[PDB]
Amino acid sequence: KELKRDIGPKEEEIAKMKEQIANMNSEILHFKRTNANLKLIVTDLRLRQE
Amino acid sequence: KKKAQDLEKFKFVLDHKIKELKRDIVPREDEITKMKQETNNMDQYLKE
Amino acid sequence: QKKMYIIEKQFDQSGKGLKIDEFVRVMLTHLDFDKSDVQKEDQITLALIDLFKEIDVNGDGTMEWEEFSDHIISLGLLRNDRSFKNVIKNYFPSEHIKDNQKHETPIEKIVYFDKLKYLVVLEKDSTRFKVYNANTAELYYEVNAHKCAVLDAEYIPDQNLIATSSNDLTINFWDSSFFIPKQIVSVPEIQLCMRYAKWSTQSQPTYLYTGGSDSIIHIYDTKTLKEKGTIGGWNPFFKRDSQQYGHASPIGDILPINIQTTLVTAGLDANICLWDAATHLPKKELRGHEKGVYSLDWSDFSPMNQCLLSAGLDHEAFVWNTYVKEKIFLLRGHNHPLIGVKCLPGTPQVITADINGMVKVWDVRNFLCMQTINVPTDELNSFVVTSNQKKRIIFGARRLYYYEYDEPKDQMLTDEKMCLRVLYNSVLLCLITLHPDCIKVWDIRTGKLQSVYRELSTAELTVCVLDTRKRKLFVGDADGNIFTVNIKNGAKMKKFEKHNNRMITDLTHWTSKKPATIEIGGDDDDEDGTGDSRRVVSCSREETVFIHDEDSSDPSRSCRYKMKQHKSSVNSLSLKQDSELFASASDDGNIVITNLNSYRQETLPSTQYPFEKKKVIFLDPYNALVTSDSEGYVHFYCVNNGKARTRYLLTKKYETTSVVNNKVDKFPVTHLAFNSDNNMLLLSDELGNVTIWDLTIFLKKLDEIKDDNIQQQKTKQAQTPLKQTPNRASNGFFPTELDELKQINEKQISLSQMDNLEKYFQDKDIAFVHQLKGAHNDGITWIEVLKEYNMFATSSFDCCCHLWSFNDYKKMGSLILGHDIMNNNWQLRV
């Protein structure tokens, strides 16, 4: 009975950090959108130069 | 004698699951794993 | 306990009781054993087949879930009996007995004259023997027994004499009626031991056997008090062909086993000569001890468990059989030489003591160290066991130390303390008397003190709640800790989240059980089991109430909601049967009925008097809520399980006559025992009075109001026309217009009838069935409605829970702690 139940918390501690993965996944698209925004901010200035 | 016979197996066997449950746990706790590698590598992607 | 419900499910799967094969297979699947290992597979199969046959009373070869549950109930009551047989309670130190006389010298010996009660202590190097009380260590006389050091002091009942043997080669028999030396007898040698032997046979004269330094037992008849014979000893002078029988060292002790007519002599040579006292010749010589044996006792607990117990220079006690030469048993764990072995008469308890104050109490049925005692004595000189009316150990050391048995102080009481509550575990077929120290379980059939679950919690046990299956006792402590303890042996199987360090005023176990309905139609990925959601609702001296989840393993996360429903301590919680609404009461005069699943509060409309709600209980199955206040008011409200306001209906002035002043004052109802069988309310009175109201009229009126509401609803629904609806919706833009509809009135019909609930319900609607006046010595703490037997066990501050039979309400029983069931006035037959 003890060894049928020690499995529980030990397995539960296996992984609880998917929150970090999801947060940084959102950050990934955040940076992607920043990429395009700043690309446009560069290109508009490129054109005005000429 | 018969009671001690009906109790010797009770003294011995359940050690079988005593070992079995721990052995099953062996590969169970293991999966502090590739999800973390993913979180590390996608973090690298974030960096760039 | 986790697979209890799964086993129940599989057993019910049979529908006609599990036969041998399914029975064994179900327990094999569910058991925490090795199914794949043939050894325990077959052993458990055999054990379960034996269980099946035992359960087989009908003899048809079918064990129903009913039979299995009944057997589990019997085993739970036996576990309640927290010994599994012959409770061997630990020898606690005598809080009431200690040495009083100024022993000018160390205690040498102590012989307790049970016949005289003369605990004659022979002081080391002291020429006077101080006879104390074995029950109070009260010295009677400090009388000069002899001229020099006294070795032994034995009682000769045959002449009412206290014989004292001294190194001066004298023996003085003193008339115990006056403690004057009746006879002084000179001896050629000093006898180290001196024991009165009164063998069982009527024709054998009583012999005071004295074992001196010569190893020869000098035999003095207790009448003339003079030597008449010498038993075999190490006598090198008598050099002849006689076989060496006896001991080569001075006789340390003489043990008259009158049952076997055996004079047992233990010598320094490690021999124990069993001499035939009929002939005084050697019947045997027990051997196996490493050094001189000094103390011998004769554990006669059972004829099949008879054991001589020998101790001495050896640090361990040897168990011996009259036939079996080899030492039967050896009590271990002793760190130093054992002073001796005692076999308490009338109990299986054998006490073996080391020189360092370490005592082991063993069960001769198993010879296991049932108890461990650390006597506060730097050096212990001897010990004597008093078995007269009390199991006490008197340790003769630097002081007269006393240890006492743990018998219940007031047996007739359901407990030595307040009988706080009564639980009718109809499943257990027993009454559980909750008391401050512990929750005591009592066989309903016999009323015996079954379980004394001492230490069930870190605090006193003030609440005991039966499980929905009546298989687990929920205990809440004043510290704020709740837990589930198996009602079998008082083990705290689980705990819940702690309160805010406040005593749990009330604990309830509401189990939302999911009905078994066949479902057709669905396409989704949701594999969720139909678990039965059990929640312990706990109220304390706080505005917050904890809803712990039994299904939730974590005690802290058990609290599915920390819900604030009242402005003060929640006096009581009452779960309305067949509903999720539980009514909580507080001294502020406000009652809040909250839905556990929805956690929504519906406050009862303020009564004419917001008296501190003392006891709140739903008139189950009626939609009626009854609240007894501190001022003797029992308010009955039409509580609706839906969103309809729980409507106040009546307020009966609960009046119980004062025992002393004869004045019927306002007495808060300490407990409300709603016997749904009688529709009756057992109101507990601080005078211990089991007042009894008939709620039939009020319940009928509330039911008829329900019927009127239902009929009105049906009539309203019967006149519904048909209308069409618009198509495709859309374009939103909902505006706000509140006041453009405040000028539409002047149409009222049938509006003043349902608002007269207060007078529609009259105090006459609540009949007063009876009054068990003086039903308890003090306030009745509880009244458990043992509905099945038309029974109700009232708990009160009298420390008793008296059985009161609804047919008469008379006190047909009173759970009596002591095993004196004859005095236990339990007329209950199941």
Q: What secondary structure does DSSP assign to C32-56, as a single string?
A: SS-SS-HHHHHHHHHHHHHHHHHH-
DSSP string, C658-686: -TTT--EEE---S-EEEETTTTEEEEEET
Contact C457, C475 (CB under 8 A): yes
Q: Residue C311 and residue C342: Cα distance in Å, rounded? A: 10
The C-alpha torsion from C482 through C487 and C490 to C496, rounded to 10°, is -20
**CA B25, B28, B33, B35 torsion-angle sign:** negative
- Work out the number of other CB atoms within 10 angstroms of the CB of residue B25: 17
Locus of tokens 């001991």: C247
Name the minimum distance, in Å, from the CA of C47 to any CA of chain A.
Answer: 19
- The answer to whether B36 contacts A17, with C-beta atoms less than 8 Å apart, is yes
Q: C263: part of which helix (H) or strand (E)?
A: strand C262-266
Q: Residue C824 and residue C413: Cα distance in Å, rounded? A: 9
DSSP for residue C789: G
Contact C659, C785 (CB under 8 A): no
Kindly tell me the burial class for residue C169, based on how many C-beta atoms sit within 10 Å of its own C-beta (0-12, 13-18, 19 or more).
middle
DSSP for residue C413: S
Residue B34 contacts A, CB cutoff 8 Å: no
List of residues 6+ apart from A22 with CB closer than 8 A: none
- The answer to whether A14 contacts B36, with C-beta atoms less than 8 Å apart, is no
- Work out the number of other CB atoms within 10 angstroms of the CB of residue C405: 18
User: φ and ψ at C303, to 5 degrees?
Assistant: -60, -35
**How many residues are listed for chain C in this entry?**
830
Contact C319, C330 (CB under 8 A): yes
Q: Residue C567 and residue C504: Cα distance in Å, rounded? A: 16
Q: Which amino acid is at C197?
A: A
Closest CA to C804 of C823, C780, C830: C780
Contact C589, C567 (CB under 8 A): no
Contact C193, C151 (CB under 8 A): yes
Contact C418, C436 (CB under 8 A): yes
Contacts of residue C50 in chain B, CB cutoff 8 Å? none
Minimal Cβ distance to B13: which of C39, C46, C47: C39
Between chain A and chain C, how many beta carbons pairs sit less than 8 Å apart?
3
DSSP string, C496-524: ----SS--EEEEEEEEEPPP---------
Contact C698, C765 (CB under 8 A): yes
Q: Residue C765 and residue C170: Cα distance in Å, rounded? A: 90
Name the minimum distance, in Å, from the CA of A38 to any CA of chain B.
Answer: 15
Contact C616, C627 (CB under 8 A): yes
Name the minimum distance, in Å, from the CA of C475 to any CA of chain A.
Answer: 24
Contacts of residue B13 in chain C, CB cutoff 8 Å? 33-34, 37, 39-40, 43
- Work out the number of other CB atoms within 10 angstroms of the CB of residue B47: 7
Name the minimum distance, in Å, from the CA of C707 to any CA of chain B.
Answer: 59
Residue C489 three-state SS: coil
Largest Cα separation within chain A, whole Å, is 80
- Taking the alpha carbons at both ends of chain A, their separation in whole angstroms is 80
Which residues face C738 on adjacent strands? none
Give start and end residues of each alpha helix (H) in chain B. 2-12, 15-28, 35-47
List of residues 6+ apart from C13 with CB closer than 8 A: none
Q: Angle at the Cα of C264 (from C262 to C267), degrees rounded to 5?
A: 160
Chains touching A by CB (3 or more pairs below 8 Å): B, C
What CA–CA distances, in Å, run from C476 to B31, C92, C687, C799?
Answer: 39, 28, 26, 19
In the Cβ-directed half-sphere of C348, how many Cα atoms lie within 13 Å? 20
Cis bond before residue C515 (omega within 30° of 0): no
Q: Residue C172 and residue C161: Cα distance in Å, rounded? A: 9
Q: Residue C39 and residue C464: Cα distance in Å, rounded? A: 42
List of residues 6+ apart from B34 with CB closer than 8 A: none
Q: Residue C114 and residue C103: Cα distance in Å, rounded? A: 22
Kindly tell me the burial class for residue C127, based on how many C-beta atoms sit within 10 Å of its own C-beta (0-12, 13-18, 19 or more).
middle
Q: Residue C555 and residue C569: Cα distance in Å, rounded? A: 22
- The answer to whether C33 contacts B14, with C-beta atoms less than 8 Å apart, is yes
Nearest CA in chain C to A4: C32
In the structure encoding, which two tokens stand for residue C758, read together?
Answer: 């207060």
User: φ and ψ at C495, to 5 degrees?
Assistant: -130, 165
Tell me the structure's resolution in angstroms, rounded to a single decimal: 3.6
List of residues 6+ apart from C363 with CB closer than 8 A: C86, C88, C348, C349, C350, C370
- Taking the alpha carbons at both ends of chain B, their separation in whole angstroms is 77
- The answer to whether C40 contacts B6, with C-beta atoms less than 8 Å apart, is no
Contact C422, C108 (CB under 8 A): no
Nearest CA in chain A to B34: A15
Residue B42 contacts A, CB cutoff 8 Å: yes
In the structure encoding, which two tokens stand for residue C637, read together?
Answer: 């409200």
List of residues 6+ apart from A2 with CB closer than 8 A: none
Q: Residue C387 and residue C371: Cα distance in Å, rounded? A: 17
Q: Residue C214 and residue C780: Cα distance in Å, rounded? A: 70
Q: Residue C396 and residue C777: Cα distance in Å, rounded? A: 42
Q: Residue C423 and residue C678: Cα distance in Å, rounded? A: 18
Q: Residue C479 and residue C692: Cα distance in Å, rounded? A: 34
DSSP string, C155-200: EEGGGTEEEEEETTTEEEEEETTTTEEEEEEE-SS-EEEEEEE--S
List of residues 6+ apart from C581 with CB closer than 8 A: C593, C594, C595, C596, C602, C639, C641
**CA C189, C195, C201, C203 torsion-angle sign:** positive
Kindly tell me the burial class for residue C785, based on how many C-beta atoms sit within 10 Å of its own C-beta (0-12, 13-18, 19 or more).
buried
In the structure encoding, which two tokens stand for residue C638, read together?
Answer: 């039409």
Q: Residue C158 and residue A34: Cα distance in Å, rounded? A: 113
Resolved by? cryo-EM
Contact C160, C219 (CB under 8 A): no
Residue A4 contacts C, CB cutoff 8 Å: yes
Q: Residue B13 and residue C57: Cα distance in Å, rounded? A: 32
Q: C351: part of which helix (H) or strand (E)?
A: strand C349-354
Q: Residue C573 and residue C570: Cα distance in Å, rounded? A: 7
Locus of tokens 């009390």: C390
Which residues face C814 on adjacent strands? C802
Burial C212-232 (b: 16+ CB within 10 A, else e): bebbbbbbbbbeebebeebbb
- Work out the number of other CB atoms within 10 angstroms of the CB of residue C737: 6
Residues belonging to the binding site of C for Ca(2+) are 56, 58, 60, 62, 67
Contact C214, C268 (CB under 8 A): no
Q: B1: part of which helix (H) or strand (E)?
A: none
Which residues face C404 on adjacent strands? C92, C392
DSSP string, C527-541: ------EEEEEEEES
- The answer to whether B28 contacts A14, with C-beta atoms less than 8 Å apart, is yes
- The answer to whether B9 contacts C43, with C-beta atoms less than 8 Å apart, is yes
Contacts of residue C553 in chain A, CB cutoff 8 Å? 8
Q: Residue C409 and residue C406: Cα distance in Å, rounded? A: 8
CA C372 to chain centre: 21
